[PDB]
Amino acid sequence: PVEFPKSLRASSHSSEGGTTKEEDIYGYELLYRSAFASYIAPTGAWNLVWFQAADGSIKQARWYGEWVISTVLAPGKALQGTPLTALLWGPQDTVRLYYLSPQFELQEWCWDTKNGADNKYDGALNAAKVKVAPYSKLGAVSFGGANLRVYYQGTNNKLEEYTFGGGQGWKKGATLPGDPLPGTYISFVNRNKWDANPPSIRGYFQTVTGSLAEQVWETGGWRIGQFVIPAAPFLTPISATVSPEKDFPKIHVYWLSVESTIIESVNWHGWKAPKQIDNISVVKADISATSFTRDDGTVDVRIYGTAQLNVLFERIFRYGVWEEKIHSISVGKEIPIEVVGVAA
Amino acid sequence: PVEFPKSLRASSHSSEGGTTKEEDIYGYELLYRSAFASYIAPTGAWNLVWFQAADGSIKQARWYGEWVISTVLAPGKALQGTPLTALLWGPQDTVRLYYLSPQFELQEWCWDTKNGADNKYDGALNAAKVKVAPYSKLGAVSFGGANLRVYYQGTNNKLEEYTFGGGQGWKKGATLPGDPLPGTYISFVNRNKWDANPPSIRGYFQTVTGSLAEQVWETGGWRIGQFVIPAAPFLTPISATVSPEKDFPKIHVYWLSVESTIIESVNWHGWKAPKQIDNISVVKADISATSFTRDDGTVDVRIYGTAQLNVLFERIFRYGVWEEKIHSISVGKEIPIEVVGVAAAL
Numbered sequence: 001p002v003e004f005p006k007s008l009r010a011s012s013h014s015s016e017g018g019t020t021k022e023e024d025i026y027g028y029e030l031l032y033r034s035a036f037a038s039y040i041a042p043t044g045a046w047n048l049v050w051f052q053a054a055d056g057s058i059k060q061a062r063w064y065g066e067w068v069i070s071t072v073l074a075p076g077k078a079l080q081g082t083p084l085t086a087l088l089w090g091p092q093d094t095v096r097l098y099y100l101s102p103q104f105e106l107q108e109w110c111w112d113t114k115n116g117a118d119n120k121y122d123g124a125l126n127a128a129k130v131k132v133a134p135y136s137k138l139g140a141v142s143f144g145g146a147n148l149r150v151y152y153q154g155t156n157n158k159l160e161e162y163t164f165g166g167g168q169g170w171k172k173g174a175t176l177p178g179d180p181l182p183g184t185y186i187s188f189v190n191r192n193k194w195d196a197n198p199p200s201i202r203g204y205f206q207t208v209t210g211s212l213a214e215q216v217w218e219t220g221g222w223r224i225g226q227f228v229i230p231a232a233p234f235l236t237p238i239s240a241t242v243s244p245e246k247d248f249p250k251i252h253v254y255w256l257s258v259e260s261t262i263i264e265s266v267n268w269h270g271w272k273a274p275k276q277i278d279n280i281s282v283v284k285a286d287i288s289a290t291s292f293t294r295d296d297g298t299v300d301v302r303i304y305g306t307a308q309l310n311v312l313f314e315r316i317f318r319y320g321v322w323e324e325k326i327h328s329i330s331v332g333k334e335i336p337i338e339v340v341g342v343a344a
Numbered sequence: 345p346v347e348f349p350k351s352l353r354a355s356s357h358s359s360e361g362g363t364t365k366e367e368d369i370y371g372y373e374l375l376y377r378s379a380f381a382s383y384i385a386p387t388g389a390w391n392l393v394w395f396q397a398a399d400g401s402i403k404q405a406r407w408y409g410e411w412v413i414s415t416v417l418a419p420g421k422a423l424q425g426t427p428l429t430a431l432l433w434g435p436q437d438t439v440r441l442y443y444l445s446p447q448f449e450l451q452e453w454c455w456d457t458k459n460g461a462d463n464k465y466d467g468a469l470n471a472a473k474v475k476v477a478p479y480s481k482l483g484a485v486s487f488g489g490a491n492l493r494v495y496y497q498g499t500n501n502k503l504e505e506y507t508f509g510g511g512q513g514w515k516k517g518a519t520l521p522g523d524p525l526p527g528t529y530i531s532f533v534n535r536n537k538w539d540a541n542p543p544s545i546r547g548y549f550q551t552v553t554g555s556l557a558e559q560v561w562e563t564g565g566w567r568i569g570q571f572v573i574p575a576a577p578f579l580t581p582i583s584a585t586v587s588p589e590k591d592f593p594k595i596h597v598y599w600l601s602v603e604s605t606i607i608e609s610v611n612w613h614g615w616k617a618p619k620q621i622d623n624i625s626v627v628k629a630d631i632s633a634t635s636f637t638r639d640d641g642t643v644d645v646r647i648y649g650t651a652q653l654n655v656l657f658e659r660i661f662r663y664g665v666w667e668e669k670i671h672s673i674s675v676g677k678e679i680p681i682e683v684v685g686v687a688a689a690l
């Protein structure tokens with residue numbers, strides 16, 4: 001068997017006090033510690049997830065009655081271990097996926113379906129040849145339709161912005177305040193509606209002290225926000241999502257604890273105390289959260305990431321509860337392995 | 345501060361029962377979880393270590409009175425996150441470094457220094473365009489001078505061999521027995537002297553059950569060896585090295601515990617019980633061990649890898665003891681970060 005810390009739970013079927021003996025799955029055609037991007041349709045009618053396969057291609061999992069896997073970027077287009085982040089607007093007929101080339105330049109994949117089209121192509125961002133820090137992660141928001149903002153870590157480790165819209169093409173945007181940890185995960189959201197202008201932007205990242213911090217944009221410029229977590233694991237994965245709950249934006253910020261369990265902090269008329277959403281230890285690796293608002297004004301959340309041993313998980317917050325059944329999305333060949341809990 | 349499990353020790357200055365509050369170093373120009381290759385000179389006169397920088401280049405650290413850092417492969421030569429393994433013979437004037445291209449093909453870097461040379465160049469292996477499983481690790485041994493064997497994981501997850509020597513060029517070699525874990529770390533050693541023929545080859549890897557296992561080559565062919573660890577962490581780093589102790593090959597095999605502490609098994613007139621060499625938790629990431637025999641008959645060991653938070657460590661076994669001073673080799677810009685030991689999630 002493989003050995004696992006006895007005090008941690010590897011799966012939903014692990015014993016209540018930790019792992020004793022169980023079977024878990026190794027999906028070896030998923031890149032170990034793959035990045036993830038995702039977007040659930042604002043209607044909730046379908047789901048999109050993107051990930052990196054072991055062969056380096058970027059693939060897509062789409063749920064529409066059932067999960068279907070496809071390849072969107074051939075092997076060689078993306079850095080091995082590229083970050084990923086996605087945009088969806090129109091309200092839901094135009095998709096952009098951002099990633100890094102093997103030369104650490106920002107890249108954009110475009111999928112247009114407006115008016116029955118089905119066009120997939122390399123976006124104009126590629127031609128700006130924007131070199132980033134080689135360990136940079138990626139965030140992005142959209143507003144007013146096709147006004148786009150891409151967030152990255154520059155070669156001097158500051159967080160940087162690239163902008164698109166209003167006929168200007170891609171141009172360098174703001175240099176953000178704060179002192180980001182080199183290689184920090186980053187996640188940016190827009191609290192205002194996809195077709196609204198101006199946006200209301202929040203980004204989440206880890207500072208050089210290890211704390212978690214917040215970027216704020218409102219009319220008037222960029223500011224460091226009130227969201228402060230004094231200590232977090234080194235290079236903890238971070239992902240945030242926002243959707244209106246009872247007509248007010250509900251920000252969900254997720255990161256990993258020292259036990260590699262998912263911690264959630266909610267902003268909705270103020271910040272709520274952080275809370276562990278479940279006590280199952282995921283693989284310390286990228287997570288991706290997305291959300292939508294139902295007809296009665298409640299907000300659903302999905303989180304994608306890597307579970308033991310190398311499985312694409314989907315955690316579901318629906319009708320006000322985290323579902324104890326954690327879904328898995330098969331992306332290729334798999335082998336089952338016995339896992340035994342071992343103490344120090 | 346950054347949070348670290350309270351029951352683990354992040355460095356040698358951590359408190360005795362685990363981490364309380366301390367300062368640690370993040371070297372951010374070292375690729376996080378870099379691969380490592382290494383070789384100490386058989387005379388012990390100098391050390392070589394290879395690693396991947398954050399920008400994807402492959403760099404070398406060379407100790408000869410002091411550490412000197414150089415770049416040996418420019419950005420774009422290697423897969424980001426490439427495995428690394430090195431050979432040294434002549435007894436110590438010919439170096440080869442194996443890595444993967446961004447297209448998952450075996451690549452070879454050559455450094456020849458015999459007779460005053462300083463020649464660095466791409467090897468003939470590159471032109472063979474050998475495609476490997478994209479998560480393949482790499483091992484290698486040499487014998488009879490320039491007879492070379494490179495070990496990798498094929499697309500069907502079996503361990504495979506490529507051969508060089510005897511005027512034949514690079515050719516496909518054996519398919520090895522056993523059922524290797526996809527993406528297993530692998531480490532191969534030659535128990536016989538560099539100029540001797542036949543060799544005596546041992547390889548260490550992790551199986552689909554999670555156990556650790558051993559490949560054996562002697563005259564007659566390959567077989568599965570008697571070294572068995574029934575359970576180990578998923579995709580645990582593995583590194584082995586061998587050097588003669590009292591005219592008998594002494595194999596050291598290293599892997600990580602669930603606490604990410606380094607475990608050692610020795611083979612020297614039989615396998616000894618596995619034992620933790622120290623209780624400091626390294627980053628769960630590639631390690632590289634090398635060894636040589638002093639002219640008094642005793643075997644020194646060096647181990648390189650990633651320590652908290654991201655620094656290149658050197659652990660030293662010298663004159664029969666693991667030295668308490670665990671060195672760090674700076675490879676670029678660094679920032680100090682405060683680390684606090686934390687018991688629960690919140």
Ligand SMILES: CO[C@@H]1O[C@@H](C)[C@@H](O)[C@@H](O)[C@@H]1O
Pocket residue numbers: 096108110122123124125146148164
């Ligand atoms: C029409 O241009 C395409 O769509 C825009 C919204 C941008 O994503 C641009 O980079 C892309 O090439």
Ligand SMILES: CO[C@@H]1O[C@@H](C)[C@@H](O)[C@@H](O)[C@@H]1O
Pocket residue numbers: 149161163173174198199217
């Ligand atoms: C109006 O200002 C522009 O758009 C805002 C939404 C921000 O992206 C800002 O950095 C940018 O300069």
Ligand SMILES: CO[C@@H]1O[C@@H](C)[C@@H](O)[C@@H](O)[C@@H]1O
Pocket residue numbers: 202214216224225226227267
């Ligand atoms: C007004 O406060 C700002 O906006 C809120 C929605 C939060 O993002 C808060 O952390 C931030 O400082």
Ligand SMILES: CO[C@@H]1O[C@@H](C)[C@@H](O)[C@@H](O)[C@@H]1O
Pocket residue numbers: 440452454466467468469490492508
């Ligand atoms: C002279 O040839 C060089 O040395 C041999 C030992 C091999 O490493 C070969 O691939 C390399 O090109």
Ligand SMILES: CO[C@@H]1O[C@@H](C)[C@@H](O)[C@@H](O)[C@@H]1O
Pocket residue numbers: 493505507517518543561
């Ligand atoms: C003589 O046989 C060749 O040399 C041995 C040392 C092994 O490398 C074997 O796989 C190879 O076929």
Ligand SMILES: CO[C@@H]1O[C@@H](C)[C@@H](O)[C@@H](O)[C@@H]1O
Pocket residue numbers: 546558560568569570571611
């Ligand atoms: C003869 O036995 C073989 O050689 C020994 C040196 C060990 O490597 C052992 O595990 C292996 O089975």
